[PDB]
From a paper:
Here we describe extendable linear, curved and angled protein building blocks, as well as inter-block interactions, that conform to specified geometric standards; assemblies designed using these blocks inherit their extendability and regular interaction surfaces, enabling them to be expanded or contracted by varying the number of modules, and reinforced with secondary struts. We construct twistless helix repeat (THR) protein blocks from identical straight α-helices (typically 2–4 helices in each unit); the length of the blocks can be varied simply by varying the number of repeat units. Restricting helical geometry to ideal straight helices with zero helical twist in principle considerably limits what types of structure could be built, but this is more than compensated by the great simplification of downstream material design, as illustrated below. Using X-ray crystallography and electron microscopy, we validate nanomaterial designs ranging from simple polygonal and circular oligomers that can be concentrically nested, up to large polyhedral nanocages and unbounded straight ‘train track’ assemblies with reconfigurable sizes and geometries that can be readily blueprinted.
To generate straight, linear THRs, we set Δθ to zero. This results in perfectly straight repeat proteins in which each repeat unit is translated but not rotated relative to the previous unit. We tested 33 linear THRs (with Δh = 0) with helices either about 20 or about 40 residues in height; 23 of 33 tested designs were solubly expressed, and 13 of 19 designs analysed by SEC were primarily monomeric as designed. As for all of the THR blocks described here, because of the ideality of the block construction, the same sequence interactions can be used for the intra-block and inter-block interactions; we refer to blocks in which the terminal repeats have identical sequences to the internal repeats as uncapped, and those in which the terminal helices have polar outward-facing residues to prevent self-association (like the linear blocks above) as capped. a,b, The linear THR designs (rainbow) are nearly identical to the experimentally determined structures (grey). Side-chain sticks between α-carbon and β-carbon are shown to indicate helical phasing. a, Left: the 2.5-Å-resolution crystal structure of the short, linear [name] has a 0.8 Å CA RMSD to the design.
Residue numbers in the entry: 1 to 201
The structure:
């Protein structure tokens, strides 16, 4: 279990190095290969009954590596890895659900993935930040549903929902009018999901 994390983390760092050495042309193939390796390692830890902290460490290790590639990479590469980063985080949140992880580890992993998306949008242009906001919103709604299936706590749902609230608000200050208008719709959909999760608890 813990040896699976150590070998997986070695590969994630090994791929990250070859992403930095190579140009941005190969950085996307390495980013996709880094997430597929991390996702496959999460399933091995899933069927092995690993502690949820190992799942979070492995997930965050791959989330940081993906973020590092997006930061080094251009504007087009930023949005691509963001999709990869959220897809990998949604897989990880569902493994933590299957294991019945503590709700605090769910928020921890979700905050980590949401902060990385916020960093990618900040480094990106205006049309960049709109798609990140949709990605960020859909990830936060997934994490709210995971907390709903785990009992959670009214303060944890409020904490995660407001973390996504402040993240989306920071994107509104990032771009012009058409972005600030779409953030309001995005904020409404998010607040609607947190409305139902707080209702059923």
């Amino acid at each position: 279990s813990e040896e699976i994390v150590e070998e997986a983390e070695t590969a994630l760092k090994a791929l990250l190095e070859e992403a930095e050495k190579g140009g941005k042309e190969d950085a996307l193939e390495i980013a996709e290969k880094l997430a597929e390796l991390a996702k496959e390692a999460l399933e091995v830890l899933l069927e092995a009954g690993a502690s949820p902290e190992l799942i979070v460490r492995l997930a965050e290790t791959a989330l940081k590596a993906l973020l590092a590639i997006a930061e080094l990479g251009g504007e087009e590469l930023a949005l691509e890895i963001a999709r990869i980063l959220a897809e990998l985080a949604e897989v990880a949140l569902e493994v933590l659900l299957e294991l019945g992880a503590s709700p605090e580890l769910i928020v921890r992993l979700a905050e980590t993935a949401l902060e990385a998306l916020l960093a990618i949008a900040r480094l990106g242009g205006e049309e960049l930040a709109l798609e990140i906001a949709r990605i960020l919103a859909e990830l936060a709604e997934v994490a709210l549903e995971v907390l709903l299936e785990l009992g959670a706590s009214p303060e944890l749902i409020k904490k995660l929902a407001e973390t996504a609230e402040e993240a989306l608000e920071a994107i509104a200050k990032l771009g012009g009018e058409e972005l600030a208008e779409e953030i309001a719709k995005i904020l409404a959909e998010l607040a609607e999901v947190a409305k139902e999760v707080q209702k059923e608890l």
